[PDB]
From Swiss-Prot, chain A:
Primary gene name: WDR46
Phylogenetic placement of the source organism: Eukaryota, Metazoa, Chordata, Craniata, Vertebrata
Name of this chain's protein: WD repeat-containing protein 46
Oligomer status and interactors: Part of the small subunit (SSU) processome, composed of more than 70 proteins and the RNA chaperone small nucleolar RNA (snoRNA) U3. Interacts with DDX21, NCL, NOP2 and EBNA1BP2.
Domain of life of the source: Eukaryota
Function description: Scaffold component of the nucleolar structure. Required for localization of DDX21 and NCL to the granular compartment of the nucleolus. Part of the small subunit (SSU) processome, first precursor of the small eukaryotic ribosomal subunit. During the assembly of the SSU processome in the nucleolus, many ribosome biogenesis factors, an RNA chaperone and ribosomal proteins associate with the nascent pre-rRNA and work in concert to generate RNA folding, modifications, rearrangements and cleavage as well as targeted degradation of pre-ribosomal RNA by the RNA exosome.
Species for this entry: Homo sapiens
Ranges occupied by WD repeats: 10-49, 52-91, 94-131
Cellular location(s): Nucleus, Nucleolus
UniProtKB/Swiss-Prot annotation, chain C:
Subcellular location: Nucleus, Nucleolus; Chromosome
Name listed for the protein in its UniProt record: U3 small nucleolar ribonucleoprotein protein MPP10
Function: Component of the 60-80S U3 small nucleolar ribonucleoprotein (U3 snoRNP). Required for the early cleavages during pre-18S ribosomal RNA processing. Part of the small subunit (SSU) processome, first precursor of the small eukaryotic ribosomal subunit. During the assembly of the SSU processome in the nucleolus, many ribosome biogenesis factors, an RNA chaperone and ribosomal proteins associate with the nascent pre-rRNA and work in concert to generate RNA folding, modifications, rearrangements and cleavage as well as targeted degradation of pre-ribosomal RNA by the RNA exosome.
Record region (Disordered): 22-63
Assigned protein family: Belongs to the MPP10 family.
Crosslink site: Glycyl lysine isopeptide (Lys-Gly) (interchain with G-Cter in SUMO2): K19
Biased composition (Basic and acidic residues): 22-39
PTM (free text): Phosphorylated in M (mitotic) phase.
Superkingdom as given in the UniProt entry: Eukaryota
Coiled coil: 38-63
Lineage of producing organism: Eukaryota, Metazoa, Chordata, Craniata, Vertebrata
Residues of the full protein shown: 537 to 599 of 681
Subunit structure: Part of the small subunit (SSU) processome, composed of more than 70 proteins and the RNA chaperone small nucleolar RNA (snoRNA) U3. Component of a heterotrimeric complex containing IMP3, IMP4 and MPHOSPH10. Interacts with IMP3 and IMP4.
Feature: compositional bias, Basic residues: 40-62
Swiss-Prot record, chain D:
GO molecular function: RNA binding
Gene name per UniProt: WDR36
Name of the protein in its database record: WD repeat-containing protein 36
Additional comment: Depletion of WDR36 mRNA in cultured cells causes apoptotic cell death and consistently associates with a reduced 21S rRNA and delay of 18S rRNA maturation.
Top-level taxon: Eukaryota
Summary of the function given for this chain in its UniProt record: Part of the small subunit (SSU) processome, first precursor of the small eukaryotic ribosomal subunit. During the assembly of the SSU processome in the nucleolus, many ribosome biogenesis factors, an RNA chaperone and ribosomal proteins associate with the nascent pre-rRNA and work in concert to generate RNA folding, modifications, rearrangements and cleavage as well as targeted degradation of pre-ribosomal RNA by the RNA exosome. Involved in the nucleolar processing of SSU 18S rRNA. Involved in T-cell activation and highly coregulated with IL2.
The organism of origin for this protein: Homo sapiens (Human)
SMART domains (UniProt xref): WD40
Keywords: Disease variant, Glaucoma, Nucleus, Phosphoprotein, Repeat, Ribosome biogenesis, rRNA processing, Sensory transduction, Vision, WD repeat
Matching PANTHER family: WD REPEAT-CONTAINING PROTEIN 36 (PTHR22840:SF12)
Cellular localisation: Nucleus, Nucleolus
From Swiss-Prot, chain E:
Record family assignment: Belongs to the universal ribosomal protein uS4 family.
Assembly description: Part of the small subunit (SSU) processome, composed of more than 70 proteins and the RNA chaperone small nucleolar RNA (snoRNA) U3. Component of a heterotrimeric complex containing IMP3, IMP4 and MPHOSPH10. Interacts with MPHOSPH10.
Superkingdom: Eukaryota
Role description: Component of the 60-80S U3 small nucleolar ribonucleoprotein (U3 snoRNP). Required for the early cleavages during pre-18S ribosomal RNA processing. Part of the small subunit (SSU) processome, first precursor of the small eukaryotic ribosomal subunit. During the assembly of the SSU processome in the nucleolus, many ribosome biogenesis factors, an RNA chaperone and ribosomal proteins associate with the nascent pre-rRNA and work in concert to generate RNA folding, modifications, rearrangements and cleavage as well as targeted degradation of pre-ribosomal RNA by the RNA exosome.
Official protein name in the record: U3 small nucleolar ribonucleoprotein protein IMP3
Cell compartment(s), UniProt: Nucleus, Nucleolus
Domain annotation S4 RNA-binding: ranges: 1-52
Amino acid sequence: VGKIVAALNARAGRLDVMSQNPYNAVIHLGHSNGTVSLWSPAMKEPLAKILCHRGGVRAVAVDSTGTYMATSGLDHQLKIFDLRGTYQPLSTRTLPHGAGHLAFSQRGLLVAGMGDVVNIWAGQGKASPPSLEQPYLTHRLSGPVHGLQFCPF
Amino acid sequence: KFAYRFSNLLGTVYRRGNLNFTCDGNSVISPVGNRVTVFDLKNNKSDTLPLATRYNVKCVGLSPDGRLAIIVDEGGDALLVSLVCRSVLHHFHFKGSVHSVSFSPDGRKFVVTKGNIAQMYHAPGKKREFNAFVLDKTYFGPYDETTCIDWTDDSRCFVVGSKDMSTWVFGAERWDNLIYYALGGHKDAIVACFFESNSLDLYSLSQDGVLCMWQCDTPPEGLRLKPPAGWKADLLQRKVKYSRLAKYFFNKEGDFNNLTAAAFHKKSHLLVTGFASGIFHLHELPEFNLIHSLSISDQSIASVAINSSGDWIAFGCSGLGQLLVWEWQSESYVLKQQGHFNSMVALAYSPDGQYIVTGGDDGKVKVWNTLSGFCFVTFTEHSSGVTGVTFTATGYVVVTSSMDGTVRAFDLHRYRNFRTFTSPRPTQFSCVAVDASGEIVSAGAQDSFEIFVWSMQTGRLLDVLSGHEGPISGLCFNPMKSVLASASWDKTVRLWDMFDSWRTKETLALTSDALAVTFRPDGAELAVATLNSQITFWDPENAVQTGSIEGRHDLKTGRKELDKITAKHAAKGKAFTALCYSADGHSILAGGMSKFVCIYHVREQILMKRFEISCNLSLDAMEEFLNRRKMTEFGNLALIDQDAGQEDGVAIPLPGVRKGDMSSRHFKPEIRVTSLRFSPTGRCWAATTTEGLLIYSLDTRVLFDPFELDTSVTPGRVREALRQQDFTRAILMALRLNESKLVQEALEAVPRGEIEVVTSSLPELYVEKVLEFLASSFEVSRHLEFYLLWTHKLLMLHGQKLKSRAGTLLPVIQFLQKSIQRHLDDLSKLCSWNHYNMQYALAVSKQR
Amino acid sequence: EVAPVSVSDAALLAPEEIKEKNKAGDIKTAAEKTATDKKRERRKKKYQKRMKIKEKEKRRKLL
Amino acid sequence: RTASALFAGFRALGLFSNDIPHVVRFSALKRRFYVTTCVGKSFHTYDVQKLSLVAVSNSVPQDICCMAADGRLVFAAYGNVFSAFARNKEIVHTFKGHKAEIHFLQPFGDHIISVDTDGILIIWHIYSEEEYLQLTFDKSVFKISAILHPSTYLNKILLGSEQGSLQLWNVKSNKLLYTFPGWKVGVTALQQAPAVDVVAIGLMSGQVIIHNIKFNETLMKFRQDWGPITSISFRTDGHPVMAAGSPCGHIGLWDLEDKKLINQMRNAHSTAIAGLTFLHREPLLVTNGADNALRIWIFDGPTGEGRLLRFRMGHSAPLTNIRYYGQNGQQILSASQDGTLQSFSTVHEKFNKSLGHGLINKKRVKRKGLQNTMSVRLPPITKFAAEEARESDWDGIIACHQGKLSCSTWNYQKSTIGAYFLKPKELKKDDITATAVDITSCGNFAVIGLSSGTVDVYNMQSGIHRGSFGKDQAHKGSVRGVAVDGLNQLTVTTGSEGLLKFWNFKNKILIHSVSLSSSPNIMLLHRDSGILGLALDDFSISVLDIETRKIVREFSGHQGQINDMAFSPDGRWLISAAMDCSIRTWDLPSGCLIDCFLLDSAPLNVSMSPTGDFLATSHVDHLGIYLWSNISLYSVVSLRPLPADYVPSIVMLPGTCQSDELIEYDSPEQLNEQLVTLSLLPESRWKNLLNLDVIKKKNKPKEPPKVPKSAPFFIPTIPGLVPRYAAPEQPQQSKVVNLGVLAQKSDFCLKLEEGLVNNKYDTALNLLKESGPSGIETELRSLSPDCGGSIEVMQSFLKMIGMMLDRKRDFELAQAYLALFLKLHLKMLPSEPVLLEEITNLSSQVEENWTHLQSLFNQSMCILNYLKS
Amino acid sequence: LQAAVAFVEQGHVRVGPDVVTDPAFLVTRSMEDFVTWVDSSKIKRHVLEYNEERDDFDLEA
RNA sequence: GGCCCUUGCGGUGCUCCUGGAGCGCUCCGGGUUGCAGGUGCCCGAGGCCGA
């Protein structure tokens, strides 16, 4: 239609971390406090606040089915969260460098962009989260990573 | 002949960078745009170092011993200099932008933080190599740009703040218990981070205004070396914890005042912090006790430093370029100066040559003392900018004309604006001119096209001179004849006679539009700059053109970043706009919109010399051919850098403003020499440009100028004559050479009582040389009355003969006079203050 | 301006402003005043009253 | 110790490549190739992507003989010792222990193999620098000429000989595995083929033998009739192509699959091939040579015809003449025997540029290229003069060639030859040649001399003759030099007959003539000072002033022909380079020798920077320009007059980093006892004592600082820059004490008390002149009886003042401090009688001293004012 | 209007002695009286040639 | 002036080092990362016109 339906004040300072859940259609917002806020255009307050890191969050990405969330922060920890009512971190790993960006494919693969290096973690995915034990593929870019996305099909 | 060297840059005290005190704590090192100035508060002095750079100085690293310093510009070029010798040692190029440089307290290592990394280098050694700094180690911790550096007093570990709101601590060499450690607990960018006096406990300050204290369990001597391993073991065969004790807030909730600068003195446990609102706070860290706080300016505080003793704190505000030194215990200012960038447009000298008055677009009139280099009186009566300024020929009176429509006169005896002249019609004045007698004041308008003339003593409008068509470019009174010459844009220069019963007027027609008019010091020749870049020399009394000078090619002008046209096409439409005769009048100085000032020989109509004002490449239009490296397929893309530069804030850039805060092109102004002036003394000259006020002074080192050389003339024969007591011949041979040290020795060798014989034997030609050397001597010589006797004898012997040729000796006498004046005045203040007072005491004892 | 040394030392206020001086620069008591001196003061006072009436009356017309 | 005093070598300019072969080095953390080339006493590193300089190494005392690279480090050998370079710049490890020059270097893991000339082979551990293993081979039986470590072989190295035998060795077991009989020609090159067990062997006869070392069969043989095979490389991008170098500079491409010659590259380099290498998995060839060239070749054209892709080049022939161009000083103009003009930047090599070859009929060169147009090529440039003014509008360089009548012109911004050939119209033959050229300051006119003795003036913009000096010819003999004054007022020329003539530039009228003792050789004029320098055939140098046309200085001491001369920008130093391989600096104001340092090679040209930082020299057979730093700028140097008949014992290498006569005088503290003298103590310290209170009051802010009420009473304190009180306290002592322990008298007051006994107040004087005005006022205020100072002590301060008036030194301090003291205690003063007797002495002394000075001051000013009116 | 914007970018118009290249430049009623062709511009050559008032001495100089 | 398979004549296709703007690599080393207070920004067309 071309009309602004909502304009909401997150009330958390600068906003730099954002992703949506395709199954859920809610918006996730990361903050330097370490919390991720669930937003909807109808409400003037966030649906929920989820404390994920001991420092500031710099990335958030959730899968197509809407089951898991992947977040990374300043404490150099990669976390996988269960979004089906429990909101506990299913997987945890400490990293040498920092995961600046994250994404999911349509089969459940997760890629983290750290510096000039990308790493992809794969799991069986059949009602299970990605296994962060050992990466699936590696590749070294010419420069530092600024954007990641999977082709749909 | 024309041997002048750059001596000082007045008018600017702070542009950008960090401030540093010298090791002893008496002097302050301040970056002024392209250069670096040292202000010596101990002796009330300011000196700009001779070094220049391609771009503005971003970082200054000062060595603990005080001998060495590292100066880095924005482009990444670094310069290793000695403060003792005030000379550049060597050059280097850091690959990327450096946020800061800090020397280790021991003096062996220094850390350079650049990009996302911090590289630690060794200190430069006595050995000279093509590569100055030998890189030692690299650390690659943070997510984002590193900001600040601090070192432990034991030089065992250092700490680096980062933009990613984490603070990293590293070890100088690999410790088994501490290789690196990371700290969080913040939600905004780290501004500074410090260490305790004798422990590894640290402080972290965020841009939000939060202070965090971190304490470790391990004493700094507890650090242990890693056990040797690898290949050293083959030769031999044959963690700590941090806890957050406290978190403090510098601001009340609901107020967003960003912390911008911080400094911390370890021995006194003192913190000084400057905020975006222009206020600074003092605290005692372990208890966080607010001692007192001040408001410095409306603009933010960019850099803050504290001296070794802890008594003085340095503040810089880049909004107005304001520099302040504050002594907290005495609750008083030691130094406080302010100068806006690109403000100055006007210039003048006092008749003595001791003071310089300037006015700017801001509307402020400032008087500077050239010897000290500091402003000492400022007049703010004018509301809009000052276009012109002038001293009266006799008194200590300064006259200004402004866009307010007012011409105001100020006295230096009482520091008041005693007379103000305004037109009956609301008009804006563009320049001022005052007669040598000082009775007549004159001004010209932007729009009313007519010259207004007022009386000084009465203050009424004597007359309105009309006849010009178009605005008046400039005015000047003849110094000896009391006639007024005014140039206008109708290709004419008109001469007006004031003390003439029949109101005789003259016109001088020109091929193109006129821009400036100046008289020679004697007043018998006149110079007009025209729009076709020609300087024409006329004889005013006979209205005949003596000569012409073509100067279009000499004004090398470069293309601006946004110009579609090339350098040559723009140059075809630009001419000279500032002219100034030398003290003798044999040479003329011309300047305009370029980094060059051209000195021409008027009689030969040839260019003797070209002076380069600046080499700063962060100023627009400096270089003729823009760099091909920056070009892309869609153009040079200047607007991205334009937005990055205008991100400074403070105001909002407005379309169509050429100059000022509202002008979009303010971060990188064009290079322009607004005005030139020459000292009446003749020992220096000055120029007002965008960079500031520039002083060029006589220096014997620049050029060798003997008078009459011979194979016999040599210092060996000079000292041989000295040993033979033939003083006169030694003096003559020492004067035939123009070395100051030899003639100094030759004069000081003579014992008293033989002075008059030497003076009588001197020929007429050498008299001027001896007077010049004596005048130079009174400034820097301990032996006052020796040179007093010399001057007294030569003057009493040759005054009558010098009277006939007094016309050509004016620059010399002026010089001599002021020197002989200077010392005298202070003695006349002090000795009499003793004498009479003592006599008064001797009176009271008698009445008892 | 702020500086550790002062270039010019002055009263900042003119000597006439501190103590006002008559045009003649001398003051005479009523006893000393001669015949002409009293006549001049009478002449000046009548001279002032005359012109002030003209200025007040002119101002009255403008209103 | 150091041969010179004023000068030291800094860097070389214009040199890119030499005979030492290059090495190609892959890097970790950066997926790129780097190629390292030796340059004299250093080396340079370039990325192969764009041939951009990335690092310049530190200098070594001797010329590098052999080079090696192993990814992490770069190894360089000079003399009998070799070192390892880290970060491509700075040495971290040096290895001594060889008595002969190193001729081969082979990096072997963490160990390095060095082979000496006499026949010693030693393996060194890099980091520990210890000697692992040493072997010797008989020089007559087996002299090593090639070293190779085949890939995929554990601890095995293959050694070849000039005799023709090959030996395979194992370093770890230290035994001879096998001996190859080989061929009687002798081995000159070894290379690893793109196979597990195959090598390529070069021979001195021009034959390359590709061999399998495991089973000893020869796969194929190729023969080039160009001399010994310098280097061999293999193409690994999927095409079986082999390239082998030759000392003629030619390259032959052999087809490995069909055992045939593909094509031959002719004149890839003018000089001998140093090293050629195919880049890994690339169709690229990297070649360098002794002609100061580095080239990249790509084989992508039809028939695999290689074409030049990139290059970095300097002068390929010895230099003739060099000169700084421009007043900024970042660029130098140089001409060489190859017949081209080039510009070299002194800050970075990216601003280097070439002006091209001398070419008549330029449009012909466009159609047919540089080659096949050799006839129109011009002879090499011998002399030239350039001026920066008017360079944008028209030409600014005039140059005279070897044995040619005409003079050529050059354009800087266009970076090509000019449009005029300047000559007299009448002459056409080349029997007469042009000898001396000069260009005027304004840049309009150029003055050309001839061997016949005629001097002409031409306009630079149009090239039209503007007249000539003399009725028919200026000089009888050849014109050696011409010069034009800066103001275009006097033109001075020289002749072979020995006459020096001065002319008017405008109307061309002779003024004066000077005879010379010997024939002048070279001539230069320092325009701004007006100082003219002459070098004569009798090895002396004569200096004369152009204005008075008379000799001012004579310099002798050179033992050879003087080649070129140079002036410092200030005009105080004359630098002359001679054939005796010495560069001498003369001090014009004194006329005595200051510096003389010897050189390995005779210097041809010398020129001083316009800024004065650097000195540039060029040599007889070297291809580059060498810069020498003037150390007077960055350090203080005391000039010392050397004896005239001096020969420098110590030689200084070019490219490596490592009395009554003089004029200086120091003024004594006092010329005479009766003379009044003043100190140069800063003005702010003593002139503001009487007005101190009001000066401090204005400094305080308009609005006082905001102080919180909760703030405590005690805040930390800094005692001050100078201690007014001598003793703060008498490790773990008590801090609660009774009276009589803490200091109760100021250090100044203590010194004053001692001054009474011995009549000496110098100690108190030093404290008084060191403390600042705020401190001085406090000290004098403390002197009062109320503040704790006895009236006896105030008597001491009055006697201090009197003493300074008898010595008549520090006169301004005497008046300043006494004035403050009078202001403070005037009310107490007349009551106490003792202080009066000091005043009566003091009052007389200040009266007689001021009155004598006040008269001398007043008579001076009144005379000066009378001169004004 | 596209021609008018073109001229200021190519530096053919001056306001007084100063030549301005910024299209965003508001001109005062007084200053609009002194906008004219800069000297030695090809457009002023065309105008003077049309009016039969072209002399090479003054323009080129 | 010189040119001799030439031209007062013309055209093409590649190469020619980003100031900040391809950072990080001798050795050593990197492991046990051990919820203060935020309400923004945008919204005016009338011609002392030219064709």
